[PDB]
Amino acid sequence: LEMVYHSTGINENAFRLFVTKPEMFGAATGAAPAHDALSLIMLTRFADWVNALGEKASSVLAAFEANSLTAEQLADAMNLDANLLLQASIQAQNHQHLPPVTPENAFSCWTSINTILQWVNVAQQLNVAPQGVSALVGLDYIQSMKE
Amino acid sequence: TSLKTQQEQTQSQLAFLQRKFSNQALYNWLRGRLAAIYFQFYDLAVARC
Amino acid sequence: LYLPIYATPADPKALLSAAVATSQGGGKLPESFMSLWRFPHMLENARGMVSQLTQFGSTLQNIIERQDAEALNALLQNQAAELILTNLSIQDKTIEEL
Amino acid sequence: VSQLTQFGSTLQNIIERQDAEALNALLQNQAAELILTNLSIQDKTIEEL
Amino acid sequence: INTDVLGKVFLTKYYMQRYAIHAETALILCNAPISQRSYDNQPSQFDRLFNTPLLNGQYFSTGDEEIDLNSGSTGDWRKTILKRAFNIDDVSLFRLLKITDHDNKDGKIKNNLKNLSNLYIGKLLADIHQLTIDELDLLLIAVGEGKTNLSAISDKQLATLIRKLNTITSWLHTQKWSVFQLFIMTSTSYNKTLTPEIKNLLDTVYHGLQGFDKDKADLLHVMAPYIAATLQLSSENVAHSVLLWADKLQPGDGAMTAEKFWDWLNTKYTPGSSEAVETQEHIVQYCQALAQ
Amino acid sequence: LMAEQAYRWELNDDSARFIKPGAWQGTYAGLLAGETLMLSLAQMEDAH
């Protein structure tokens, strides 16, 4: 578990938070955190996102450990448009993810934040708004589940 | 590829510089706390003299 | 007949590191105990005890400094060891160039 | 007074360590910034080839 | 030909030299509407900007219909035409709309030529300075002229705004400074979230200033060393000057000063514990202002 | 604090307390703790 902590590169207090409250990191509720590779990769991604936040990371992590973090604060932290993050969160809420994303966890849990950031990354890869990705994912033309 | 690796090695060493105990911030706090103690102790010393 | 346009890669992104701080709760004073000695004696006693604590604090600071100078010292050799492999590959492939 | 002199020697040691560590941190920021231009030069040498 | 037209030919010659842009683009920069007329056997500016290439066999032209610029509205083909012409996404399109006009309560705008010209003016303001819409907005806020609307502005005021933007961009380029750094240094709104650094600052100040007597010595001078230690300063008097500047600024939504900060720390602060305090957000704002 | 009791007995000043909490801070490994306590004792002797 030392080899875990050092290899992941996560900050000491976010590692403390991960150990104490796996639910905040979106691990299955009521269970001890896993050192499974599936959890290792998400821990590494969390550490990379914290490093990307730069100097803002100190406030971002504190607002994340409280139920305080919002779209606007995180947008200021990542130097992104607040409307962009708000609409990415809206699109994630509208679409059926697993686990589901709801306004009371969209920035409280790390998994919901990762889903919102994935929406933002895919939108900026396509150089379109998240509504563009929402229009794209509606083109399920090879299925019988829905029209 | 070697130069890109050197960029990572410089970032890892810079991160170790900021993340360690005995970074800049500890010495700044040590200086401020000790300077305040030093002046407060100075007034008592001169009064005793 | 058409000569295609060629794309030039952009400058590399400046890597950024995150430095967060840690906070710990302050202590609380224990319960004071009535002594037997008069004030000048219990003061020479406590002052001695405190100066011993300051001496442990100076030893502790010296340990702190040496521990992290030695962690940097060990780190630099791992970086050098890893940097050498690419130079070996370059030199070998220069031979193939000749 | 001898206690004050001892606080003064600790304070001087703190002064010295604080600014040696501020130089130590500065050098890594300069190295990190100097690396980017070398990466651009190496990439553009590839375009030369 | 008269004083008015001859006044901005010098301006367009300046913009075409300074920015190396085309004549029509410089005229747009001179607060001139996009020209529907096509001459010199060339497609017009409106046609080149919007109509070509034709999108799904639909021809775009000025009309009385109303077009929505709300990013989440998922507008019709006209919004797509605007996005393609401006090479921007929906969120940045709404941001550009907010930049251009401060009187547009809703995202919907009239499809007349004047609004399109205003949007093109706003887009070219960022294009000529090698900034996108986000840095353009943050720059205009950092300047202080962001309050003024581009839609309702005088020609001389627009020229002054152009000169200010060019000068500040040149200064930032000389200083190796990002627009975000300038915005942070010039920012007034402060995040009201407790941080470990701010908590450590509060703990150090409370412990050092405990037992302080108002008449014995100045509060600011006594508080300066702990602020210097906590906020990573080389010199103590730098912290003293910063504290004086903060007292003159009175940071935050609840105007905060050294006396108020010390009283709050003395009364309502318990170090080492995480508790919710009504004034704690103002304390955080004051600490953020000191760090800034 | 044991010296605090002695001072509050030799002088009737049961209210006067000189040793203050927070001399140990776990953020900074408790460094300078003894120099804060020593300053407190120097103030206590000066007042005594």
Radius of gyration of chain A using CA atoms only = 16 Å
> What structural class should be given to the helix and strand makeup of chain A?
mainly alpha
- How far is it from the N-terminal to the C-terminal residue of chain A, by CA? 49 Å
Helix content of chain A: 55-70%
H/E topology pattern of chain A: HHHHHHHH
Question: Largest interface, and how many residues on either side?
Answer: C-F, 33 and 31 residues
Please give the largest β-sheet of chain A.
Answer: none
How many beta-strand runs of chain A? 0
What is the subunit organization of this protein?
part of a larger assembly
Query: What is the overall shape of chain A?
Result: globular
Helical region count of chain A? 8
The percent range for strand residues of chain A is under 5%
Coiled coil (chain D): 17-49
Protein name (chain D): TcdA1
PDB class: toxin
Keywords: Bacterial toxin, Tc toxin, toxin
Describe the structure.
- This is part of a larger assembly, with six copies of chain A.
- Chain A has 147 residues and is mostly helical.
- Helix content of chain A is 60%, strand content 0%.
- Chain A is built from eight helices and no strands.
- Chain A has helices at residues 2-8, 12-20, 37-53, 57-65, 71-78, 82-94, 110-126, 130-137.
- In chain A, α5 (71-78) packs across α6 (82-94) and α7 crosses α8 (130-137).
- The C-F interface holds C 22-35, 37-39, 42-43, 45-47, 50-57, 60-61, 64 and F 1-7, 9-10, 19-27, 29-35, 37-38, 41, 44-45, 48.
- Chain E: This is TcdA1.
